[PDB]
Amino acid sequence: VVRPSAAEEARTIAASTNVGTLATLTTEGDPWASFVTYGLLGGAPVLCVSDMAEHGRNLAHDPRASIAIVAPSAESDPLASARVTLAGVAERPEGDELAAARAAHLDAVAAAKYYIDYSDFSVWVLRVQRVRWVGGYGRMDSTTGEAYAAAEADPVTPRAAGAIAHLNADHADSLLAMARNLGGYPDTGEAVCTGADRYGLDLRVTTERGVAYTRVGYAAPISSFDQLRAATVELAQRAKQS
Amino acid sequence: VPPPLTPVADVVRPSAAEEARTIAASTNVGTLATLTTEGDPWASFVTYGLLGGAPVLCVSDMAEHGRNLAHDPRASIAIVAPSAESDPLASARVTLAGVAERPEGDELAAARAAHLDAVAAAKYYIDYSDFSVWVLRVQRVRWVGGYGRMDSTTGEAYAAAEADPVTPRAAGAIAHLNADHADSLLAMARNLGGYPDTGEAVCTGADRYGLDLRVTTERGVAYTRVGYAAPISSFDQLRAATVELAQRAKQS
Ligand SMILES: [Mg+2]
Ligand code: NI
Ligand code: NI
């Protein structure tokens, strides 16, 4: 059963918020961290920067930039956060791309309304070349920029916590059937869902030796959160027919 | 923005250095900027404690940013104060920039403690040789207080200042003032804040020198500030300092 790729995780974190921190170079080559807001143009952060802000000047002088993005978290342990560095090169777009970048920024950051059309604020789009993902504790990987651009953000992740808890609170019995008949543990006595994404559900199952982890895939990947309902109903039905 | 109807004696306001120190102390997460070994700017999520204003990091020697620091110890960190406001541009933020150094001896032990106190899970990493303690020697500061003021400061000014003991812990107090002391806030606006024509007053900030008030006046919405009778230095002193404010407001 397929799992989101690092590229997908990265896209998903990017799409989870509109704030991060840009790293740029001063003219002397010192590393400069700046708070920034952004929208996305197919996975690409779109910044609206004042030309006299330190980071606007940095980009104009050396357009190498990276942005670290942190997914909003329920967990109060910061080290459990899901986070990503998108690194490459920022460029001021033109023409059609500029108009689309502008729009994407505007609908992700309402207040940019008041800045984006002054001639002394510029729109930058970060051409992502490299990606480093850290998915909380002990999950990490790198990807290429092309893999990142090819991937899609997960439409289930943003509302997964609620879905997960609802499944555990009200569907423990269906979760158990899935584990027994689809997940490879016919004798487990208890199954808890520990994650949901567009490909399937992760299950923690009781064994005589502790717990095991299995995964059950939907009939096929889903494309919106509203399809999760039908996907779990089909999972429960397929489990009874085994 | 309508002006005060009457003059008020200037109220002490935290300095940019103090604001910067206060933002730093408001949380234990930020983002480090370092140089890769090929000179690219690298942004990393990090956790930190403070040693007299100085971020203390605990970094894996095999993490990209650990390897960056070992090679070139120039670093900066951006820190964003936790906010109620959902408009990110209203956020208070700061960049602390300088040079990171692995401390030794007494300083290392104090750095270690400070990091541990601020980040519970660092418990499981900080004594292992794979992880190093770094302290950021702050040389310059850029502060952006929301839509409000912005300014730069020197590292010495930053080191000399103190974090506000009230502001980071004021959310409950602020809300209690707004929910239960509308009358007192109103009287302060009218009699001490320069806006006798205030009809409603809301406290939008509290710090160790005084309270910021947003006022609904017959002429529209305005902003003022009222100062304690003297600065305070601990949160438990806030109640008594706001009571004296209310009393001074009734006495004209
Ligand atoms: Mg321009
Ligand atoms: Ni249900
Ligand atoms: Ni009170």
Side-chain angles (χ1 to χ4, degrees), chain A, chain B residues 1-148 150-252:
Chain A
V1 191
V2 296
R3 185 164 283 295
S5 67
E8 292 182 288
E9 296 281 349
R11 290 289 289 257
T12 298
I13 290 162
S16 71
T17 181
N18 63 353
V19 295
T21 302
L22 197 68
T24 61
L25 296 181
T26 70
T27 60
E28 313 193 303
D30 300 336
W32 190 247
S34 309
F35 169 69
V36 298
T37 54
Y38 68 88
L40 298 168
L41 185 61
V46 185
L47 314 179
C48 175
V49 187
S50 172
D51 294 6
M52 277 320 118
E54 179 134 43
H55 63 288
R57 293 183 85 178
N58 292 344
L59 288 177
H61 170 86
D62 189 338
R64 293 184 315 275
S66 65
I67 187 177
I69 300 167
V70 182
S73 187
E75 265 146 318
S76 66
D77 181 7
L79 299 195
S81 292
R83 72 211 78 159
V84 73
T85 304
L86 288 9
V89 145
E91 295 184 340
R92 292 187 221 66
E94 294 175 330
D96 292 0
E97 201 189 21
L98 172 53
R102 183 183 165 284
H105 187 92
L106 276 175
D107 57 8
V109 191
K113 171 184 153 102
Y114 304 52
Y115 296 101
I116 199 166
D117 295 314
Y118 292 132
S119 51
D120 58 350
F121 284 71
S122 297
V123 170
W124 298 83
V125 178
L126 175 66
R127 309 307 181 187
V128 178
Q129 298 177 331
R130 266 159 293 286
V131 172
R132 181 72 194 158
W133 159 75
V134 182
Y137 278 111
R139 293 155 50 62
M140 67 203 69
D141 207 351
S142 293
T143 81
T144 66
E146 73 167 12
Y148 175 79
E152 298 197 331
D154 195 294
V156 174
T157 299
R159 302 176 61 186
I164 298 293
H166 178 66
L167 282 166
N168 285 329
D170 291 358
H171 303 269
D173 48 14
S174 284
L175 293 180
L176 180 50
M178 293 174 201
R180 290 180 174 166
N181 303 323
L182 312 177
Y185 293 83
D187 308 311
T188 180
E190 183 186 357
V192 159
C193 173
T194 56
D197 57 52
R198 74 188 303 182
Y199 299 100
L201 301 179
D202 298 314
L203 305 186
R204 186 225 297 150
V205 300
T206 278
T207 68
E208 283 166 337
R209 301 178 58 81
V211 295
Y213 288 91
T214 190
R215 178 153 172 94
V216 291
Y218 305 138
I222 53 186
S223 288
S224 73
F225 183 76
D226 291 334
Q227 292 173 9
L228 178 60
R229 172 187 161 69
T232 65
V233 167
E234 186 277 337
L235 262 173
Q237 299 285 326
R238 199 201 316 154
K240 300 303 128 74
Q241 297 159 359
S242 296
Chain B
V1 161
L5 302 186
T6 56
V8 200
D10 283 288
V11 179
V12 178
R13 189 173 256 102
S15 66
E18 290 183 295
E19 292 286 345
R21 290 289 289 258
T22 299
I23 288 162
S26 73
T27 182
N28 65 355
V29 294
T31 297
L32 198 66
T34 60
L35 298 178
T36 71
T37 57
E38 314 184 311
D40 299 332
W42 189 250
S44 313
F45 170 71
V46 298
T47 56
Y48 69 89
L50 298 167
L51 187 60
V56 185
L57 316 178
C58 175
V59 185
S60 172
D61 293 6
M62 314 141 283
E64 181 129 23
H65 61 289
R67 293 189 273 116
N68 296 343
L69 289 177
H71 168 259
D72 184 338
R74 288 135 93 208
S76 63
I77 187 178
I79 300 168
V80 181
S83 188
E85 264 155 340
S86 64
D87 179 9
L89 288 320
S91 290
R93 356 47 137 121
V94 73
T95 304
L96 303 182
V99 146
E101 295 183 341
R102 292 185 227 238
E104 294 174 9
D106 285 342
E107 200 188 21
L108 170 55
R112 180 188 163 283
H115 186 92
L116 279 175
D117 282 8
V119 192
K123 172 180 155 102
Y124 303 128
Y125 302 82
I126 199 167
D127 294 316
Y128 293 82
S129 48
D130 297 323
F131 285 71
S132 297
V133 169
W134 297 87
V135 177
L136 176 66
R137 310 305 182 189
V138 178
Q139 297 179 329
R140 67 181 181 99
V141 172
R142 182 69 193 158
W143 162 74
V144 181
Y147 286 108
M150 64 199 159
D151 209 350
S152 293
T153 82
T154 65
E156 72 158 4
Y158 176 82
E162 300 194 337
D164 195 290
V166 169
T167 301
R169 301 179 55 204
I174 298 292
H176 159 53
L177 282 169
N178 288 331
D180 309 310
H181 291 294
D183 49 11
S184 281
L185 293 180
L186 181 50
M188 294 175 199
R190 292 181 175 167
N191 304 321
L192 313 177
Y195 287 85
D197 66 333
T198 302
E200 273 174 335
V202 159
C203 173
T204 59
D207 57 57
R208 74 193 304 179
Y209 303 101
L211 301 179
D212 297 315
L213 306 184
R214 191 186 58 241
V215 299
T216 285
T217 71
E218 178 163 40
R219 302 167 286 145
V221 179
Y223 299 87
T224 190
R225 176 154 173 95
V226 292
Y228 308 139
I232 62 175
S233 288
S234 64
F235 183 79
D236 67 274
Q237 293 264 353
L238 177 59
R239 170 186 293 160
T242 65
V243 167
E244 185 274 339
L245 262 171
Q247 294 177 332
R248 199 201 315 154
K250 300 302 128 74
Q251 297 159 359
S252 166

PDB file of all heavy atoms in Angstrom, chain A residues 8 11-12 15 22 24 30 40 47 57 62 70 80-81 86 89 98 114 138 141 149-150 153 167 200 212 214 234 240:
ATOM      1  N   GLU A   8       5.296  14.871  -1.786  1.00  0.00           N
ATOM      2  CA  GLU A   8       3.920  15.103  -1.373  1.00  0.00           C
ATOM      3  C   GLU A   8       3.869  15.683   0.038  1.00  0.00           C
ATOM      4  O   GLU A   8       3.101  16.629   0.294  1.00  0.00           O
ATOM      5  CB  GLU A   8       3.103  13.791  -1.501  1.00  0.00           C
ATOM      6  CG  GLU A   8       2.898  13.361  -2.952  1.00  0.00           C
ATOM      7  CD  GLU A   8       2.062  12.100  -3.121  1.00  0.00           C
ATOM      8  OE1 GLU A   8       2.570  10.994  -2.804  1.00  0.00           O
ATOM      9  OE2 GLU A   8       0.902  12.233  -3.605  1.00  0.00           O
ATOM     10  N   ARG A  11       4.841  19.318  -0.198  1.00  0.00           N
ATOM     11  CA  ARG A  11       3.757  20.103  -0.782  1.00  0.00           C
ATOM     12  C   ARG A  11       2.646  20.314   0.199  1.00  0.00           C
ATOM     13  O   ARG A  11       1.990  21.381   0.165  1.00  0.00           O
ATOM     14  CB  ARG A  11       3.176  19.414  -2.028  1.00  0.00           C
ATOM     15  CG  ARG A  11       4.101  19.411  -3.232  1.00  0.00           C
ATOM     16  CD  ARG A  11       4.232  20.807  -3.814  1.00  0.00           C
ATOM     17  NE  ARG A  11       2.993  21.249  -4.479  1.00  0.00           N
ATOM     18  CZ  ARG A  11       2.810  21.277  -5.810  1.00  0.00           C
ATOM     19  NH1 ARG A  11       3.769  20.897  -6.665  1.00  0.00           N
ATOM     20  NH2 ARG A  11       1.656  21.678  -6.291  1.00  0.00           N
ATOM     21  N   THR A  12       2.404  19.291   1.044  1.00  0.00           N
ATOM     22  CA  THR A  12       1.300  19.338   1.977  1.00  0.00           C
ATOM     23  C   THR A  12       1.595  20.344   3.095  1.00  0.00           C
ATOM     24  O   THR A  12       0.745  21.132   3.499  1.00  0.00           O
ATOM     25  CB  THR A  12       0.991  17.935   2.557  1.00  0.00           C
ATOM     26  OG1 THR A  12       0.605  17.043   1.515  1.00  0.00           O
ATOM     27  CG2 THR A  12      -0.132  17.991   3.576  1.00  0.00           C
ATOM     28  N   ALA A  15       1.280  23.911   1.707  1.00  0.00           N
ATOM     29  CA  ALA A  15      -0.122  24.317   1.547  1.00  0.00           C
ATOM     30  C   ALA A  15      -0.831  24.448   2.872  1.00  0.00           C
ATOM     31  O   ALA A  15      -1.913  24.985   2.899  1.00  0.00           O
ATOM     32  CB  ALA A  15      -0.883  23.344   0.657  1.00  0.00           C
ATOM     33  N   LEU A  22      12.052  33.233   5.493  1.00  0.00           N
ATOM     34  CA  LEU A  22      12.967  33.243   4.337  1.00  0.00           C
ATOM     35  C   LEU A  22      14.390  33.344   4.832  1.00  0.00           C
ATOM     36  O   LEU A  22      14.665  34.030   5.819  1.00  0.00           O
ATOM     37  CB  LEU A  22      12.641  34.426   3.466  1.00  0.00           C
ATOM     38  CG  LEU A  22      13.171  34.414   2.046  1.00  0.00           C
ATOM     39  CD1 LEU A  22      12.502  33.339   1.182  1.00  0.00           C
ATOM     40  CD2 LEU A  22      12.888  35.809   1.507  1.00  0.00           C
ATOM     41  N   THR A  24      17.971  34.530   3.304  1.00  0.00           N
ATOM     42  CA  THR A  24      18.639  35.209   2.216  1.00  0.00           C
ATOM     43  C   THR A  24      20.047  35.615   2.670  1.00  0.00           C
ATOM     44  O   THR A  24      20.434  35.385   3.807  1.00  0.00           O
ATOM     45  CB  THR A  24      17.862  36.460   1.746  1.00  0.00           C
ATOM     46  OG1 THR A  24      17.756  37.395   2.824  1.00  0.00           O
ATOM     47  CG2 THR A  24      16.487  36.091   1.270  1.00  0.00           C
ATOM     48  N   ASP A  30      26.271  37.271   4.790  1.00  0.00           N
ATOM     49  CA  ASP A  30      25.762  36.791   6.089  1.00  0.00           C
ATOM     50  C   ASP A  30      24.388  36.198   5.899  1.00  0.00           C
ATOM     51  O   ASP A  30      23.613  36.702   5.096  1.00  0.00           O
ATOM     52  CB  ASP A  30      25.581  37.891   7.108  1.00  0.00           C
ATOM     53  CG  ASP A  30      26.862  38.632   7.450  1.00  0.00           C
ATOM     54  OD1 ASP A  30      27.975  38.083   7.275  1.00  0.00           O
ATOM     55  OD2 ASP A  30      26.695  39.755   7.989  1.00  0.00           O
ATOM     56  N   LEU A  40       0.785  30.155  -2.951  1.00  0.00           N
ATOM     57  CA  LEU A  40       1.436  29.149  -3.790  1.00  0.00           C
ATOM     58  C   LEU A  40       0.980  29.224  -5.235  1.00  0.00           C
ATOM     59  O   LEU A  40      -0.197  29.422  -5.515  1.00  0.00           O
ATOM     60  CB  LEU A  40       1.161  27.745  -3.245  1.00  0.00           C
ATOM     61  CG  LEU A  40       1.703  27.475  -1.822  1.00  0.00           C
ATOM     62  CD1 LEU A  40       1.135  26.195  -1.282  1.00  0.00           C
ATOM     63  CD2 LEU A  40       3.202  27.447  -1.797  1.00  0.00           C
ATOM     64  N   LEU A  47       6.004  35.515  -2.865  1.00  0.00           N
ATOM     65  CA  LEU A  47       6.212  36.506  -1.802  1.00  0.00           C
ATOM     66  C   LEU A  47       5.861  37.857  -2.359  1.00  0.00           C
ATOM     67  O   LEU A  47       5.972  38.076  -3.568  1.00  0.00           O
ATOM     68  CB  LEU A  47       7.672  36.541  -1.376  1.00  0.00           C
ATOM     69  CG  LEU A  47       8.326  35.193  -1.138  1.00  0.00           C
ATOM     70  CD1 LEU A  47       9.760  35.394  -0.751  1.00  0.00           C
ATOM     71  CD2 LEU A  47       7.601  34.450  -0.048  1.00  0.00           C
ATOM     72  N   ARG A  57      16.139  43.696  -0.700  1.00  0.00           N
ATOM     73  CA  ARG A  57      17.444  44.119  -1.156  1.00  0.00           C
ATOM     74  C   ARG A  57      18.330  42.894  -1.321  1.00  0.00           C
ATOM     75  O   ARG A  57      19.149  42.831  -2.248  1.00  0.00           O
ATOM     76  CB  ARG A  57      18.068  45.127  -0.169  1.00  0.00           C
ATOM     77  CG  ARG A  57      17.331  46.455  -0.097  1.00  0.00           C
ATOM     78  CD  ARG A  57      18.093  47.368   0.845  1.00  0.00           C
ATOM     79  NE  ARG A  57      19.182  48.065   0.161  1.00  0.00           N
ATOM     80  CZ  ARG A  57      19.972  48.955   0.754  1.00  0.00           C
ATOM     81  NH1 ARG A  57      19.822  49.232   2.054  1.00  0.00           N
ATOM     82  NH2 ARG A  57      20.914  49.556   0.052  1.00  0.00           N
ATOM     83  N   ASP A  62      21.385  39.066  -4.667  1.00  0.00           N
ATOM     84  CA  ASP A  62      21.671  37.643  -4.867  1.00  0.00           C
ATOM     85  C   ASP A  62      20.359  36.877  -4.674  1.00  0.00           C
ATOM     86  O   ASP A  62      19.822  36.804  -3.554  1.00  0.00           O
ATOM     87  CB  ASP A  62      22.728  37.195  -3.872  1.00  0.00           C
ATOM     88  CG  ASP A  62      23.221  35.814  -4.157  1.00  0.00           C
ATOM     89  OD1 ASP A  62      22.481  35.059  -4.819  1.00  0.00           O
ATOM     90  OD2 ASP A  62      24.336  35.485  -3.713  1.00  0.00           O
ATOM     91  N   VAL A  70       6.484  25.456   8.587  1.00  0.00           N
ATOM     92  CA  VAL A  70       6.101  24.608   9.678  1.00  0.00           C
ATOM     93  C   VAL A  70       4.556  24.462   9.655  1.00  0.00           C
ATOM     94  O   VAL A  70       3.860  25.448   9.675  1.00  0.00           O
ATOM     95  CB  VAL A  70       6.630  25.163  11.045  1.00  0.00           C
ATOM     96  CG1 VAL A  70       6.257  24.216  12.196  1.00  0.00           C
ATOM     97  CG2 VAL A  70       8.143  25.341  10.998  1.00  0.00           C
ATOM     98  N   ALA A  80       7.982  17.492  17.482  1.00  0.00           N
ATOM     99  CA  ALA A  80       7.041  16.667  16.722  1.00  0.00           C
ATOM    100  C   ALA A  80       6.498  17.375  15.476  1.00  0.00           C
ATOM    101  O   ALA A  80       5.824  16.757  14.668  1.00  0.00           O
ATOM    102  CB  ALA A  80       5.889  16.245  17.627  1.00  0.00           C
ATOM    103  N   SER A  81       6.779  18.668  15.341  1.00  0.00           N
ATOM    104  CA  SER A  81       6.306  19.462  14.181  1.00  0.00           C
ATOM    105  C   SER A  81       6.689  18.845  12.850  1.00  0.00           C
ATOM    106  O   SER A  81       7.772  18.258  12.712  1.00  0.00           O
ATOM    107  CB  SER A  81       6.900  20.869  14.245  1.00  0.00           C
ATOM    108  OG  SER A  81       6.365  21.611  15.340  1.00  0.00           O
ATOM    109  N   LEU A  86      12.281  24.669   1.532  1.00  0.00           N
ATOM    110  CA  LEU A  86      12.283  24.755   0.115  1.00  0.00           C
ATOM    111  C   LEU A  86      13.411  25.733  -0.262  1.00  0.00           C
ATOM    112  O   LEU A  86      13.421  26.873   0.164  1.00  0.00           O
ATOM    113  CB  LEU A  86      10.932  25.280  -0.391  1.00  0.00           C
ATOM    114  CG  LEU A  86       9.607  24.542  -0.404  1.00  0.00           C
ATOM    115  CD1 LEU A  86       9.711  23.259   0.351  1.00  0.00           C
ATOM    116  CD2 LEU A  86       8.321  25.280  -0.045  1.00  0.00           C
ATOM    117  N   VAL A  89      15.957  29.703  -5.871  1.00  0.00           N
ATOM    118  CA  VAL A  89      16.315  30.961  -6.493  1.00  0.00           C
ATOM    119  C   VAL A  89      15.022  31.716  -6.715  1.00  0.00           C
ATOM    120  O   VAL A  89      14.125  31.187  -7.381  1.00  0.00           O
ATOM    121  CB  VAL A  89      17.090  30.673  -7.839  1.00  0.00           C
ATOM    122  CG1 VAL A  89      16.812  31.680  -8.939  1.00  0.00           C
ATOM    123  CG2 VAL A  89      18.579  30.615  -7.596  1.00  0.00           C
ATOM    124  N   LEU A  98       3.157  36.671 -13.661  1.00  0.00           N
ATOM    125  CA  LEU A  98       3.030  37.724 -12.657  1.00  0.00           C
ATOM    126  C   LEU A  98       1.599  37.917 -12.220  1.00  0.00           C
ATOM    127  O   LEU A  98       1.307  38.028 -11.028  1.00  0.00           O
ATOM    128  CB  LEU A  98       3.568  39.038 -13.195  1.00  0.00           C
ATOM    129  CG  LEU A  98       3.362  40.320 -12.373  1.00  0.00           C
ATOM    130  CD1 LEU A  98       3.855  40.215 -10.930  1.00  0.00           C
ATOM    131  CD2 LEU A  98       4.099  41.435 -13.114  1.00  0.00           C
ATOM    132  N   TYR A 114      -3.421  45.607   0.530  1.00  0.00           N
ATOM    133  CA  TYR A 114      -3.003  46.993   0.781  1.00  0.00           C
ATOM    134  C   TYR A 114      -1.596  47.330   0.277  1.00  0.00           C
ATOM    135  O   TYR A 114      -1.214  48.499   0.300  1.00  0.00           O
ATOM    136  CB  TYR A 114      -3.067  47.346   2.285  1.00  0.00           C
ATOM    137  CG  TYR A 114      -4.401  47.140   2.991  1.00  0.00           C
ATOM    138  CD1 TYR A 114      -5.072  45.928   2.908  1.00  0.00           C
ATOM    139  CD2 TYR A 114      -4.964  48.138   3.799  1.00  0.00           C
ATOM    140  CE1 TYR A 114      -6.274  45.708   3.565  1.00  0.00           C
ATOM    141  CE2 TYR A 114      -6.175  47.925   4.468  1.00  0.00           C
ATOM    142  CZ  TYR A 114      -6.823  46.700   4.344  1.00  0.00           C
ATOM    143  OH  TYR A 114      -8.014  46.421   4.976  1.00  0.00           O
ATOM    144  N   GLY A 138      11.982  11.528  13.712  1.00  0.00           N
ATOM    145  CA  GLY A 138      12.609  10.500  12.873  1.00  0.00           C
ATOM    146  C   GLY A 138      12.110  10.179  11.474  1.00  0.00           C
ATOM    147  O   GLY A 138      12.348   9.093  10.993  1.00  0.00           O
ATOM    148  N   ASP A 141      13.722  13.320   4.740  1.00  0.00           N
ATOM    149  CA  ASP A 141      14.266  12.992   3.433  1.00  0.00           C
ATOM    150  C   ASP A 141      14.493  14.269   2.635  1.00  0.00           C
ATOM    151  O   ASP A 141      14.018  15.341   3.033  1.00  0.00           O
ATOM    152  CB  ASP A 141      13.309  12.090   2.674  1.00  0.00           C
ATOM    153  CG  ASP A 141      14.007  11.204   1.659  1.00  0.00           C
ATOM    154  OD1 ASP A 141      15.211  11.341   1.364  1.00  0.00           O
ATOM    155  OD2 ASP A 141      13.310  10.339   1.120  1.00  0.00           O
ATOM    156  N   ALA A 149       7.716  19.842  -7.644  1.00  0.00           N
ATOM    157  CA  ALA A 149       6.738  20.448  -8.572  1.00  0.00           C
ATOM    158  C   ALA A 149       5.736  19.414  -9.131  1.00  0.00           C
ATOM    159  O   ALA A 149       4.557  19.761  -9.414  1.00  0.00           O
ATOM    160  CB  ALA A 149       7.464  21.126  -9.719  1.00  0.00           C
ATOM    161  N   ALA A 150       6.208  18.173  -9.341  1.00  0.00           N
ATOM    162  CA  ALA A 150       5.330  17.109  -9.905  1.00  0.00           C
ATOM    163  C   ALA A 150       4.279  16.645  -8.895  1.00  0.00           C
ATOM    164  O   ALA A 150       3.209  16.238  -9.279  1.00  0.00           O
ATOM    165  CB  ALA A 150       6.158  15.916 -10.378  1.00  0.00           C
ATOM    166  N   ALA A 153      -0.241  18.479  -3.060  1.00  0.00           N
ATOM    167  CA  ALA A 153      -0.575  18.554  -1.670  1.00  0.00           C
ATOM    168  C   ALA A 153      -1.717  17.571  -1.371  1.00  0.00           C
ATOM    169  O   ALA A 153      -2.598  17.379  -2.217  1.00  0.00           O
ATOM    170  CB  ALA A 153      -0.996  19.965  -1.336  1.00  0.00           C
ATOM    171  N   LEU A 167     -13.019   8.422  13.691  1.00  0.00           N
ATOM    172  CA  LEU A 167     -12.961   7.024  13.396  1.00  0.00           C
ATOM    173  C   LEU A 167     -12.687   6.238  14.662  1.00  0.00           C
ATOM    174  O   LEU A 167     -13.196   5.133  14.812  1.00  0.00           O
ATOM    175  CB  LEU A 167     -11.847   6.716  12.408  1.00  0.00           C
ATOM    176  CG  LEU A 167     -12.146   7.031  10.965  1.00  0.00           C
ATOM    177  CD1 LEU A 167     -10.837   6.991  10.179  1.00  0.00           C
ATOM    178  CD2 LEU A 167     -13.135   6.007  10.394  1.00  0.00           C
ATOM    179  N   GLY A 200      -4.756   6.042   2.072  1.00  0.00           N
ATOM    180  CA  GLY A 200      -5.191   4.993   2.987  1.00  0.00           C
ATOM    181  C   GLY A 200      -5.087   5.359   4.443  1.00  0.00           C
ATOM    182  O   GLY A 200      -4.757   6.505   4.783  1.00  0.00           O
ATOM    183  N   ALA A 212       1.585  -3.703  16.591  1.00  0.00           N
ATOM    184  CA  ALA A 212       2.110  -3.702  15.246  1.00  0.00           C
ATOM    185  C   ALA A 212       1.402  -2.590  14.501  1.00  0.00           C
ATOM    186  O   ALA A 212       0.434  -1.985  14.995  1.00  0.00           O
ATOM    187  CB  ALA A 212       1.909  -5.037  14.548  1.00  0.00           C
ATOM    188  N   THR A 214      -0.074  -1.532  10.632  1.00  0.00           N
ATOM    189  CA  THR A 214      -0.382  -1.963   9.300  1.00  0.00           C
ATOM    190  C   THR A 214      -1.049  -0.803   8.633  1.00  0.00           C
ATOM    191  O   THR A 214      -1.175   0.289   9.217  1.00  0.00           O
ATOM    192  CB  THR A 214      -1.193  -3.278   9.290  1.00  0.00           C
ATOM    193  OG1 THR A 214      -1.275  -3.793   7.960  1.00  0.00           O
ATOM    194  CG2 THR A 214      -2.580  -3.128   9.874  1.00  0.00           C
ATOM    195  N   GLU A 234     -16.418   2.405   1.854  1.00  0.00           N
ATOM    196  CA  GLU A 234     -15.987   1.268   1.044  1.00  0.00           C
ATOM    197  C   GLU A 234     -14.957   0.334   1.782  1.00  0.00           C
ATOM    198  O   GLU A 234     -14.985  -0.889   1.577  1.00  0.00           O
ATOM    199  CB  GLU A 234     -15.420   1.705  -0.308  1.00  0.00           C
ATOM    200  CG  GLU A 234     -15.094   0.531  -1.252  1.00  0.00           C
ATOM    201  CD  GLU A 234     -13.739  -0.134  -1.025  1.00  0.00           C
ATOM    202  OE1 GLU A 234     -12.821   0.505  -0.452  1.00  0.00           O
ATOM    203  OE2 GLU A 234     -13.568  -1.299  -1.432  1.00  0.00           O
ATOM    204  N   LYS A 240     -15.859  -6.549   5.578  1.00  0.00           N
ATOM    205  CA  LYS A 240     -16.882  -7.579   5.853  1.00  0.00           C
ATOM    206  C   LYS A 240     -16.892  -8.708   4.815  1.00  0.00           C
ATOM    207  O   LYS A 240     -17.153  -9.848   5.161  1.00  0.00           O
ATOM    208  CB  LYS A 240     -18.288  -6.968   5.981  1.00  0.00           C
ATOM    209  CG  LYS A 240     -18.445  -5.944   7.101  1.00  0.00           C
ATOM    210  CD  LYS A 240     -18.090  -6.491   8.495  1.00  0.00           C
ATOM    211  CE  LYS A 240     -17.084  -5.606   9.235  1.00  0.00           C
ATOM    212  NZ  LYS A 240     -17.648  -4.325   9.757  1.00  0.00           N
TER     213      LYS A 240
END
